[model samples]
Each structure stands twice: as C-alpha cells, then as structure tokens.
Target: DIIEESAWEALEKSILYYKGRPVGTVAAFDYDQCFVRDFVSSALIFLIKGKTDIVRNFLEETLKLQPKDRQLDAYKPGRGLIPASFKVVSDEEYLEADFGEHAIARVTPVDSCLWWILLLRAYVVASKDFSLAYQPEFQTGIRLIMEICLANRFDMYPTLLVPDGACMIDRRLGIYGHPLELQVLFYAALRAAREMLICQGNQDVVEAIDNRLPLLCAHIRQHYWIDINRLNAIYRFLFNIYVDSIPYYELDKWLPKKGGYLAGNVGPSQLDTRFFALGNLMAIISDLATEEQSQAIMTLIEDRWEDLVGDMPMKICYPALENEEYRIVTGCDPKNIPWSYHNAGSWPVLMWMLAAASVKAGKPYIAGKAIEIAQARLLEDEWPEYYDGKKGRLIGKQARKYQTWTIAGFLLAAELMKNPSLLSLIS
Candidate 1:
C-alpha cells in the first residue's frame, strides 16, 4: 500500500505540471526535453497501472507539439522536444523552434533503440492498434532510423559517422568512435523493429530483420569478444567492446585480475551501474543468456548494489572515483552536479528495468529491493531526473524535477514484481 501511495502521489505531480501544456511532455534530464526518453518512461507507468486515459492524453499532447506539416524530417520528429532556449528566470511562456535536421545529425543506435521500444510498448499497452504503426509520421521515423543503421554498418570509420550528432567518447580515455554501447543499442533497435513489423503483419520486413539479427550478433561476438585474460574474457567479452583499434592481446593485459567482469565502458564508465543493469535486464528480456548465466548476473548485481549506493539503492557511479569526486559537491551549476549522466546520480528508469529483469528471473527479493529504493528516492510527489547519490536526495532541476519516467518506473516495478513469472516466460 505504501508503494502504491507513493507512486500515485508522484503521478499526480507529473499530471499537475503538464495539465494544460499542448507541447512538451517530459525531459530526459532536468534541463532538457527529450521525447523518446520521457515518452517511454511515462508510457510504461501508465501501461502498468491500466491508466489508458493518461497515456492517451500524453500521446495527444506530444502529437500537438510536433513540428507542423513536416513529414520527411525523420531526425527530429520524435526526437527531443523543444527545450526552453533561454534561462527559466520567469514563468513567461517560452517557445522555440524544433531543432530540425541539426537535432538528428548524429543518429546513433541508442536513439533508434529507445524510440522503437517505447513506441511499440506504448502501442501494445494502449490500443493494440497496429494502424498506429502505419501512420505516415511514425513510418518515416522508422525508415529514417533504418537507413542510418545501414549507413553506419558500412562506414566503419567512427569519426565520419554520427548517428544523431551526439558525440560518442570514452570519458576515461577521451577516445572517439563506435563504442560497445552502440552495439547494444543496435541490437535492441533491430529486435524492436522486427517486433513492430510482426505486429503490423509485415512479413517481408520481419523476415529480413530476423535474418539480420544473427549477422549483427555474430559480428559483435567476433570483433568485440576478446579472449585474452580471464577478466577480459568475462567483462569485455560479454559487455564492453573497445573500438579504438586496441588489439585483443594488449587489451586483455589492461583488465583488472579480480573484478574483470565488472570492468568495461558502461555509460561513460562513471555510470557503469546503469549499463550493467541494462545489460542484465536485456539478457533476461531477450532470453539471450542461459539460466546459469542469468543467476550469476543476478548475484553480481546484488554484490555491486552496495558499491553503487552508500545510502540509497544505487548511485550512478562509485563515489570513490577520482574523476567523479566533484559529483559529491552540491550546487545548481550543471558542471558541479552529480545527478547528470556522468555524475554519481541514480536514475529511477534504470531501477524500473532492473525490477523488470528481476521479475523475469523470478527474483522477488531483488525486485522488491528496487521498488523500495525507488519509493524512498521519489520527491515532489514524483520522480526527478536523477538523485544525488552523496546526499541521498532528489535534485530540483526544472526540466526533469517532476518527470514522467520516474513515475512510469514505479508503475512498471510494481507490475513486474506482482508477476515474476514474466521473466521465465520470456526466458
């Protein structure tokens, strides 16, 4: 009952903030409005609660805010919502032009993955209407993304390719190019796209994508899987793949001997926790790994939970990292903060995924733990973009302070915990 009460309180706050807004759903972080991230987050919560009205209202609001009469712009259509270009010093109504082509110049596998999964999930839970899949706008979005992926596959050169103009860098090494995360994102997108086709009865598209899945998987395993040291074999092989031309033998020597599986590029290395959570969750959802492998991952997740958070369920990064030490400082400045992507923050969205995986794996204790952590961290009767790990409190960033993803995460966690068998079913 406490969990339900807390979630409802958060939901109300989210509803209140967007009550009359014709544009702007929820931002990914506090200061930016990203469409795919917020919609996916909000949709999950609404779906779990059987709250079709809220879902429909949010979708309608999103459609209204879309760029008027522009059907061919795939990059920005369902990308990020228009953020307030100026400082939020006053409540004066602020409006800005959608960042058109510039917004999607760096199309990455991650963006496509998020959009497809979220849209598919939303459609499935809401109306079960495959017609939504055929909407000219939605189809354009999908086609554009598929073209981007095909282009990236042949380019091979990292610097020349920017999926959605988003920079890809290893924060620890300051290197650029296609990193392992892109591969994961690509896999997710491929799977989601295939599912979408099946849902729409597009047998040709579905068959082609299904065939491509194995090729993608094989390519990743061959190039990324380093068979050097024990640690390299576990962590880098299964999760992280370095694309900076690092030879397999040399790369293996760099891995830590004891906790090698724990190493690798996980969301900029600082927020590897989220990556691990996502990786394990994906494995469970996709039935990619064996039961034994899933169990080992579950244990690993439990052990790492303590290191992830000193007081809360988990922090985005380990507080002890020298590079991330400044994240502990409290301030309003974006650079000095810890709640952002590279900082030691906690994303409730990750918590939702972890809970879903736990449910699928039949691990009620882990799922319950995730739920409890989310319940404690929620604020303003809703979830924020991220939580301050050091202070164990929620940040007050305007863009994400009262967001939809956090609310959706709670709904999803509760739903999954109630039916842990979903994990086995998927497996």
Candidate 2:
C-alpha cells in the first residue's frame, strides 16, 4: 500500500508543463521531453484516473506538430509524420519537436502518428466528447495520417512495411519488414480512424479503410498467428517429400507444446519468430487476434512464464539474439547486448498491456501474479525503465530511475484489476 501511494506521488511528480498546460515527461528527471508514443500509455493512466484535460493538451500539441506535405520535399519525411518528442523552450513558453532529425540514424518514427490517433480515440471514448474529434483540424490530421499509410505502394501484401529502428525498439534488430508491433498498431489506428472520421467529406478515405480492414485482419490472422500445432503442420509440410530438400525448421524440436504467439515479423521469405510482448498483447486488446487466438496467447504466456514473464513482469522480445546472431542482426550495437534493452529486456510499461490482455481473456490471475511480482520490487527499485538479464534480475545498465511510463504502467495495471470495464476505452 505504501508502494502504491508512492507510485501515485511519483507519477504526479513526473507530469511536465508546457505553457501552463500539463503534459507527461518521457522519463522522470532523466528525460525532459514529451514523446507521442510514451504519452499514449501515460495518457491512458490519466484517462483512467478521470483526468482528461492534460490528454487533450497532448493531442492538440502533437497535432499542431504533425508534418505538412508541402513543407518538406524530395522524399523528406512523409505527409502525416508526427514528431517523436517535444521540448519546452524559452522558459516553457515555446515547444520544439523532434521529427527524427536528431534521433539515432534519423529513423523516422512510423508508430508516433498511429499512437497519436489511438490516443485521440481513447480520450474521446473516455470523456464521451465526440466534438473534439469532429473538429476540422483533428479531422484533417486523421485524413493525412491515413493518406500516408493507405497510399498505394509497390509492396503487394496488405501489411505495412517499415525499416528497423523505426519503432519503439529505436534500433536495428531485424524488424525492418512488417514487424508485428507496427502491424498491430496500424490495425488499431485504422479502427480508431474509422471510428472518428466523418464519411460525409472523406468518402474516399472511408471507402479505402472499409476495403482494407478485413483484408489486413485476415492476412495477419492467417500469417502472423502461430502456435505449436501450426508449427507442427508447417514442419510436416516442409519435410513432406524429402527431409533434406527444404531449408531446416526447428519447430518440431523447439518451443514448448503450450507456448506460441504471433510471429514477430512476417516478411518476404523471412519470418522473425521471436515473441514480442507488446504486439501479441495489443493484438488481443485491438481485437486483431481472434477469440481463440487470444485464448491461445494467454495460455502461451502462462506456460512460458519463466521464459517470457521471468522474475519481472514481461520481456519485450523473447530469447535475446545472442553471439553471432546478435552481431549481424543488431550491427554490434553496444546498448543491445543480449537480454538487455530492446533485445529481450523487461519493460515495466508492458505491465499494463499484460494486465489488459489477461483481463480480456478471462485470465486476470496472470496479471495479478505479474503485478505482485512487480509490486514487490518496483518501489524499492525506484521505478526503473526496464530490467535486464534472462529473468530480469539485473536493473537495466543504462535504465533511468523514476521512469514516467514505468510508474504509469503499474498504476494502469492496478487500476485495471480494480475496474475491468476501463479496458473498453482502448479495447
């Protein structure tokens, strides 16, 4: 109880102000910035706690910064680009945004706009205020984002293709081709956009979304959802004629019978088989994963508790790429040494996702256990950004203390356990 009280106090302390309006800092004290992606999770906490003004401020500021098509040229960042983060300048009177110009590798963020749209929907749904979404500026902002993503491209598949480091991973780990997180976010954003967009003026955008939603859902459900049974079937198909004819698949020999999840990334002739916690859990929350699939994913997490949940609540990616694989895949990035950072480290932010998905699937006990595990150490550990090592026994080497999302995540998880209906906002 003391820890929960402290978490609330810390979360309140982490709130930053821009021009006398409240916004969340990305991390407490360590990072003095407001990031769209990070704000989405933190804003959800605000929504659950019955505070909506800060969230509205966040949406308006980010929308104001959304890139215009005419301003940048020659294949500059696309039309609906959302700034990754914003900083208060001139004693908090002005705000400057980062559109990946200063980010590592200048990798334009694909998820920021998706997150913004999703957060907008959450705010509208929670506050029951449709007028904000019906505004002209918000309508145009949603249209521009859909335009960038729904525009015709050379790629044939319905999935959105993106480069590595373009997502929360923010560094290369072979996620370049239709990563699960991006697709899941894309699906949710599309659904959110459809809900908020008025068809009177945007008939064409509405039509495209109507045409694409089912197709995208079908492609992901069929191709991305995987399990031991499906793996066994694939194994049988691959080695049917001649055992040595096809490339080897260790499916028959690897993974527990009950453990399976959506494939990490499904690209051309390539399948990233890692278990990505955010994507898989979000798939359930977004209804991208079928009912049966959601049940199966919940079962997988319970069965692979140590491998996935570990001593901490969850791993970002399972089975951290190691040795040779790590070198080639991550380009020897020092920050991503195995079982650390994006390479399978434990992020406290995912706790909310795990709790939401579990509650959705009639397995709140799974989240209950995780919350207990986190509650035991989170306050004592001072709310770290992430935990490192196989079982997440080590505090992240570079992790900052009092991370905003980390605190918000715990509060979200705790609040979800008390009142499950709040899941409907994002669900």
Candidate 3:
C-alpha cells in the first residue's frame, strides 16, 4: 500500500500552472515550459476532474498556436511550430527545449504519431458539443496533421515509410531502417483518427482509417519481423535490411532463455524489455493476442515484480542489465557515460502502459503496483523523465524533474484505477 504523495504533489503543481488558463496542457516540467503533447495529456486529467475552464483554456491556446498552412512548407523545414512546447532561440531558431533537446534534435518520426494521438485524445475527452467539433481551427489543424502524415509517407520504400524514413530505429551495426515503435505509433494514430471520426459520426473517415489499419499491419508483419536464435523475438522495432532479413518469429531463437544463454551476432538485446511491455500490451488490448498467451505474459510480468519495480522506479531495460556489464554505469548504454538516462533508467511513461496492460488482464493488484511505482517517483513535485536503474536515483543530465507526460501518466493511471470506465474512451 504505497502512498502516492509525490504524484499528488506533481498534479497539484501542474494544476497550479494551468489554473484559470486551462486544466489540460501541462507544461513539460515546472522548471522549463509546456508543449502540445503535454497539454493534450493534461487535458485528459482535467476532463476526468470535470474542470471545464482549464480544458477550454488549453484548447484555445492549442488552437491559437497551431501552425498555419504556410508554416508546414517542406521547403522551409522547421518552419512550423510543432503542437508541442518549444523555446524560441532568437527570431529564427526554435528548439524543443524540454528534455534538453534530445528528443527535439532526434527528428524521430514517432513524434508525429505522438502529436496526432494527443490531438485525438483531446477531441475524444472534450465535450460532445458540435460547436467545438466544427470550429475552423480544429478542422484545419486536424486536416493539416493528416496531410502531414500522408506527405511524410515512405510508400516508395520496401513498405510505406513511417516518420523518420526508417533510420530512427536502426540498431544494427551498419544497416539502417524504420523502427517498429514508430510503426506502432503510426497504427495507433491511424486508429485514433478513426475513433475520432466515429465519435463525430463521420462514416467516410471511419472507413478510411479501417482500410489503413490492415495495410499498416500487413506491412509491419512482412518487413519488420526477424529471425534470431530460433526464438520468435522481434527486433527493436526496426526494418534493417542486412540484420533483419530473417523472419520475425525466428529472432527469439538466439536469445538466452531458461538455464541457457547465447552469445553471437544475434542475441536478445536489452531493448527486448520495451518490446515485451508495449508490444504485448498493445496486442492484448487491441485483441491481437490469444487469451492464453496474454495471460502468460501477464503472469510473467507479475512474477518479475522486483525487476520491474526497483529502488528508483521501473527499470528501463529488462533482464535488468548490471552496472558492470556495460560502459555507461548509471543508465544502459556505454560504460563510460554511465550517467545517461536511457542507459538503464526508470521510465515512468512505461508504467502507464504496464498499468493499462494489467487492467486489460483484469489484474487490479498488478495495475495498482504500476501505479504505486509511478506515485513514488514524483520527488520534487514532478516526474523526472528517468532514474538511475542501479542506484535507484534520478538522472541529472537532460532530465527534467517535472515532466508533463509524467504527470499525465500519473493522472491517467490514477483515474483509470479509480474508475474503470475510462478504458472505454481509450480502448
């Protein structure tokens, strides 16, 4: 029965930031500023709390700042202001300052998917009044993003090109390609748009989304699945030509399972943790998994509670990489740069996915456990982007102590656990 004092503190601070202005659209961190994605998530919390004033304010701001048509001119790359929070670095330069520009500079295609999903979530949680639905800004913004998604397509590639042209997820030594996470995000966004249209009673949009869903699914199954060590493990959500030629199911054969371990060009990478929680969770929630398989996955997660919930919070890598095994000591990557957050950090966002999966599996206690871990980490009145896996301490570099997504994760998990009906909206 862990207390969520930190989560409450973080929420209160987030609310203060939005007071009278808007209940939604939390700033990425109290110390820095706000962003579009953060705001969208914050809006959900406002909706759950029945805070109309805040919600309206957030929507208005979002609408006001949305990019105009000319802003998206491809010739003028970086011309448009992404719907998320960013800092004006003089007149001509703008940087998405939160998280120290790591995400901003990465130019990952997944950001687009995240942006669209936030918009869809905002629209879904808002009042059903047709006035908001028909507003010119809302319509224009939605249409613009849809076009952006379409324009960024990689249909010329092996399959349709996702956001970053298949390079963002490249983990192979030499080969480069699209990452599976982006594909998942893309599918989720497409599905969300379809959901939004259905909510609006737009049959045409619904049909279009339905058509796109299977296409994306087919492409993912065809291009991304790989063969490793004979076990059917998926790569780190990518499409590498050289490293990914093998079938997806066969990839897992290379991984060390039970009492046996394998070392070779193909082995179970640390990124497998990300694959299991999110991929399996999505599969179960989307009705993509058999009941028996889903149950086994849930049991597996529950059995590894200690590894999942460590001193600082949720471990970013599974098989919990030891501090000595690699370079970067604090996190998961290079041993020398031991302080990198992603090296072996605690990602609060994943906790939400875990909780969602638990709820889908009808395991309230496990879901509650996820929530409890999230609740514990809101030290200093906000969620740090990640924590040190070994020391169980928050990472200092590029890490914001009060991240908006962190609050969103906390609020969403709390609300869902309290009232299961919330799942109806997202599911």
Residues 344-370 of candidate 2 have per-residue lDDT tens digits of 999999999999999988999988999
Q: Where in model 3 is the C-alpha error above 4 Å?
A: 1-6, 15-20, 23-32, 68-81, 86-109, 112-119, 122-131, 151-176, 198-208, 221-297, 303-308, 316-339, 373-383, 390-398
Q: Output the lDDT of residue 83, model 1.
A: 19
Candidate 1 global lDDT: 0.46
What ranking emerges by lDDT with the best candidate at the front? 2, 3, 1
RMSD in angstroms between candidate 2 and the native structure over all alpha carbons: 2.5
Model 3, range 79-142, lDDT digits (tens) per residue? 2234335333333433333322244233433353345454555545555554563566665555
Off by over 4 Å in 1: 1-3, 16-34, 53-113, 135-137, 157-176, 179-182, 198-208, 219-229, 232-276, 288-292, 317-341, 377-384, 389-400, 421-427
For residues 228-250, write the lDDT of model 1, one tens digit per residue: 34334434432233433333444
lDDT of each: 0.46, 0.84, 0.48
In Å, residue 156's CA in model 3 sits off its true spot by 4.4
TM-score of each: 0.65, 0.95, 0.67
Better of 1 and 2 by lDDT: 2
Pick by lDDT: 1 or 3, better one: 3
Cα RMSD for predicted model 1: 7.4
* Candidate 3 Cα RMSD (Å): 7.1
What pairs collide in candidate 2? Answer: none
